[PDB]
Amino acid sequence: ACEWLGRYRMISNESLSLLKEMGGKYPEGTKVSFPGRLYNMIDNAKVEDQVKFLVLTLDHIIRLMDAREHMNSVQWNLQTVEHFLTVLNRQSSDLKECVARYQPSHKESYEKKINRHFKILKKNLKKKEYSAQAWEQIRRAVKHHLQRMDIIASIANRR
């Protein structure tokens, strides 16, 4: 089995504590559209698809948040942003070892759905010229992603 699914929750708890610690309470108007129905579907998916979904989603969060030259407007402590991303990169690398044992797939509707969501988050971030509000919207969405990802990992680990 994928040995890292047992370790995923402790490292997830660390990632969420870093996301909280790096900055303060949200500015006004941080609620944005979130793919709850997609996560309910993945909760019910095969382990293989759960783990592939976790890797796709981790890499998307990393690629959305690792352009630090676009973070001049945030009050976040960038040392803690860098620590956060280092932890997610560890999660992704470790789960990719599990994905390597699967037959590769690129036509799953979950991959298209999560790509579209992350394209929307990036578009709205650029439209708001990387404002503190725009980044806090992404911070709130990412917190929710990571909470639902920990539940997926737990469901995969207990099969």
C-alpha positions as a Markdown table, in Angstrom:
| # | Residue | x | y | z |
|---|---|---|---|---|
| 1 | Ala | 0.0 | 0.0 | 0.0 |
| 2 | Cys | 1.0 | 3.7 | -0.2 |
| 3 | Glu | 3.0 | 4.0 | 3.1 |
| 4 | Trp | 2.7 | 7.9 | 3.0 |
| 5 | Leu | -1.1 | 7.9 | 3.5 |
| 6 | Gly | -0.4 | 7.0 | 7.2 |
| 7 | Arg | 1.9 | 10.0 | 7.6 |
| 8 | Tyr | -0.3 | 12.4 | 5.5 |
| 9 | Arg | -2.4 | 13.7 | 8.5 |
| 10 | Met | 0.5 | 14.8 | 10.7 |
| 11 | Ile | 2.1 | 16.7 | 7.8 |
| 12 | Ser | -1.3 | 18.1 | 6.7 |
| 13 | Asn | -1.9 | 19.4 | 10.3 |
| 14 | Glu | 1.6 | 21.1 | 10.0 |
| 15 | Ser | 0.7 | 22.6 | 6.6 |
| 16 | Leu | -2.6 | 24.0 | 7.9 |
| 17 | Ser | -0.9 | 25.5 | 11.1 |
| 18 | Leu | 1.7 | 27.2 | 8.8 |
| 19 | Leu | -1.1 | 28.6 | 6.6 |
| 20 | Lys | -2.8 | 30.1 | 9.8 |
| 21 | Glu | 0.5 | 31.3 | 11.4 |
| 22 | Met | 1.9 | 33.2 | 8.3 |
| 23 | Gly | -0.8 | 35.9 | 8.4 |
| 24 | Gly | -3.7 | 37.5 | 10.3 |
| 25 | Lys | -7.5 | 37.4 | 10.2 |
| 26 | Tyr | -9.1 | 37.6 | 6.7 |
| 27 | Pro | -9.9 | 41.0 | 5.2 |
| 28 | Glu | -13.6 | 41.6 | 4.2 |
| 29 | Gly | -14.9 | 39.6 | 1.1 |
| 30 | Thr | -12.7 | 36.4 | 1.0 |
| 31 | Lys | -15.5 | 33.8 | 0.3 |
| 32 | Val | -15.2 | 32.3 | -3.3 |
| 33 | Ser | -16.6 | 29.4 | -5.3 |
| 34 | Phe | -15.3 | 25.9 | -4.0 |
| 35 | Pro | -15.8 | 22.5 | -5.8 |
| 36 | Gly | -17.6 | 20.7 | -2.9 |
| 37 | Arg | -19.4 | 18.2 | -5.2 |
| 38 | Leu | -16.0 | 17.2 | -6.8 |
| 39 | Tyr | -14.6 | 16.5 | -3.3 |
| 40 | Asn | -17.7 | 14.5 | -2.3 |
| 41 | Met | -17.2 | 12.4 | -5.5 |
| 42 | Ile | -13.4 | 11.8 | -4.7 |
| 43 | Asp | -14.3 | 10.8 | -1.1 |
| 44 | Asn | -16.1 | 7.9 | -2.9 |
| 45 | Ala | -13.5 | 7.1 | -5.5 |
| 46 | Lys | -11.0 | 4.2 | -5.8 |
| 47 | Val | -7.7 | 4.7 | -3.8 |
| 48 | Glu | -5.8 | 5.1 | -7.0 |
| 49 | Asp | -7.9 | 8.1 | -8.1 |
| 50 | Gln | -7.9 | 9.5 | -4.5 |
| 51 | Val | -4.0 | 9.5 | -4.5 |
| 52 | Lys | -3.8 | 10.9 | -8.1 |
| 53 | Phe | -6.3 | 13.6 | -7.1 |
| 54 | Leu | -4.2 | 14.5 | -4.0 |
| 55 | Val | -1.0 | 14.9 | -6.1 |
| 56 | Leu | -2.8 | 17.0 | -8.8 |
| 57 | Thr | -4.3 | 19.2 | -6.2 |
| 58 | Leu | -1.1 | 19.6 | -4.1 |
| 59 | Asp | 0.9 | 20.6 | -7.3 |
| 60 | His | -1.9 | 23.1 | -8.2 |
| 61 | Ile | -1.8 | 24.8 | -4.8 |
| 62 | Ile | 2.0 | 24.9 | -5.0 |
| 63 | Arg | 2.0 | 26.5 | -8.5 |
| 64 | Leu | -0.7 | 29.0 | -7.5 |
| 65 | Met | 1.2 | 30.2 | -4.4 |
| 66 | Asp | 5.0 | 29.8 | -5.2 |
| 67 | Ala | 5.4 | 33.0 | -7.3 |
| 68 | Arg | 6.6 | 35.1 | -4.3 |
| 69 | Glu | 7.5 | 38.1 | -6.5 |
| 70 | His | 3.7 | 38.6 | -6.8 |
| 71 | Met | 3.2 | 38.7 | -2.9 |
| 72 | Asn | 4.3 | 42.4 | -2.3 |
| 73 | Ser | 0.8 | 43.3 | -1.2 |
| 74 | Val | 0.3 | 40.5 | 1.5 |
| 75 | Gln | 1.3 | 41.0 | 5.1 |
| 76 | Trp | 2.3 | 37.3 | 5.3 |
| 77 | Asn | 5.7 | 36.5 | 6.8 |
| 78 | Leu | 7.4 | 35.1 | 3.7 |
| 79 | Gln | 9.6 | 32.8 | 5.7 |
| 80 | Thr | 6.4 | 31.0 | 6.8 |
| 81 | Val | 5.0 | 31.1 | 3.3 |
| 82 | Glu | 8.2 | 29.4 | 2.1 |
| 83 | His | 7.9 | 26.8 | 5.0 |
| 84 | Phe | 4.3 | 26.1 | 4.0 |
| 85 | Leu | 5.3 | 25.5 | 0.4 |
| 86 | Thr | 8.2 | 23.3 | 1.4 |
| 87 | Val | 5.8 | 21.1 | 3.4 |
| 88 | Leu | 3.3 | 20.8 | 0.4 |
| 89 | Asn | 6.2 | 19.9 | -1.9 |
| 90 | Arg | 7.2 | 17.1 | 0.6 |
| 91 | Gln | 3.5 | 15.9 | 0.5 |
| 92 | Ser | 3.5 | 15.9 | -3.3 |
| 93 | Ser | 6.9 | 14.2 | -3.8 |
| 94 | Asp | 6.0 | 11.5 | -1.3 |
| 95 | Leu | 2.6 | 10.8 | -2.9 |
| 96 | Lys | 4.2 | 10.7 | -6.4 |
| 97 | Glu | 6.1 | 7.6 | -5.3 |
| 98 | Cys | 2.6 | 6.0 | -4.9 |
| 99 | Val | 1.3 | 7.4 | -8.2 |
| 100 | Ala | 4.4 | 5.9 | -10.0 |
| 101 | Arg | 3.0 | 2.4 | -9.2 |
| 102 | Tyr | -0.3 | 3.1 | -11.0 |
| 103 | Gln | -1.0 | 3.0 | -14.7 |
| 104 | Pro | -0.9 | 6.7 | -15.8 |
| 105 | Ser | -4.3 | 8.4 | -16.6 |
| 106 | His | -4.8 | 11.9 | -18.0 |
| 107 | Lys | -8.5 | 11.8 | -19.2 |
| 108 | Glu | -10.2 | 11.7 | -15.8 |
| 109 | Ser | -13.0 | 14.3 | -15.4 |
| 110 | Tyr | -11.6 | 15.1 | -11.9 |
| 111 | Glu | -8.3 | 16.3 | -13.5 |
| 112 | Lys | -10.3 | 18.6 | -15.9 |
| 113 | Lys | -12.4 | 19.9 | -13.0 |
| 114 | Ile | -9.5 | 20.7 | -10.7 |
| 115 | Asn | -7.6 | 22.4 | -13.6 |
| 116 | Arg | -10.6 | 24.6 | -14.4 |
| 117 | His | -11.0 | 25.6 | -10.6 |
| 118 | Phe | -7.3 | 26.5 | -10.3 |
| 119 | Lys | -7.5 | 28.5 | -13.7 |
| 120 | Ile | -10.4 | 30.5 | -12.2 |
| 121 | Leu | -8.4 | 31.2 | -8.9 |
| 122 | Lys | -5.4 | 32.4 | -11.0 |
| 123 | Lys | -7.6 | 34.5 | -13.3 |
| 124 | Asn | -9.3 | 36.3 | -10.4 |
| 125 | Leu | -5.9 | 36.8 | -8.7 |
| 126 | Lys | -4.5 | 38.6 | -11.8 |
| 127 | Lys | -7.7 | 40.5 | -12.4 |
| 128 | Lys | -7.3 | 42.0 | -8.8 |
| 129 | Glu | -3.5 | 42.8 | -9.6 |
| 130 | Tyr | -2.4 | 40.4 | -6.7 |
| 131 | Ser | -4.1 | 42.6 | -4.0 |
| 132 | Ala | -4.0 | 41.5 | -0.3 |
| 133 | Gln | -7.8 | 40.7 | -0.7 |
| 134 | Ala | -7.2 | 38.5 | -3.8 |
| 135 | Trp | -4.4 | 36.5 | -2.0 |
| 136 | Glu | -6.6 | 36.1 | 1.2 |
| 137 | Gln | -9.4 | 34.7 | -1.0 |
| 138 | Ile | -6.8 | 32.1 | -2.2 |
| 139 | Arg | -5.5 | 31.5 | 1.4 |
| 140 | Arg | -9.2 | 30.8 | 2.5 |
| 141 | Ala | -9.8 | 28.5 | -0.5 |
| 142 | Val | -6.5 | 26.6 | 0.1 |
| 143 | Lys | -7.3 | 26.1 | 3.8 |
| 144 | His | -10.6 | 24.4 | 2.7 |
| 145 | His | -8.8 | 22.3 | 0.0 |
| 146 | Leu | -6.3 | 21.1 | 2.5 |
| 147 | Gln | -9.0 | 20.1 | 5.1 |
| 148 | Arg | -10.9 | 18.1 | 2.4 |
| 149 | Met | -7.6 | 16.5 | 1.1 |
| 150 | Asp | -6.8 | 15.2 | 4.7 |
| 151 | Ile | -10.2 | 13.5 | 4.7 |
| 152 | Ile | -9.5 | 11.9 | 1.3 |
| 153 | Ala | -6.1 | 10.7 | 2.6 |
| 154 | Ser | -7.8 | 9.2 | 5.7 |
| 155 | Ile | -10.5 | 7.4 | 3.6 |
| 156 | Ala | -7.8 | 6.0 | 1.2 |
| 157 | Asn | -5.6 | 4.9 | 4.2 |
| 158 | Arg | -8.4 | 2.8 | 5.8 |
| 159 | Arg | -9.3 | 0.7 | 2.7 |
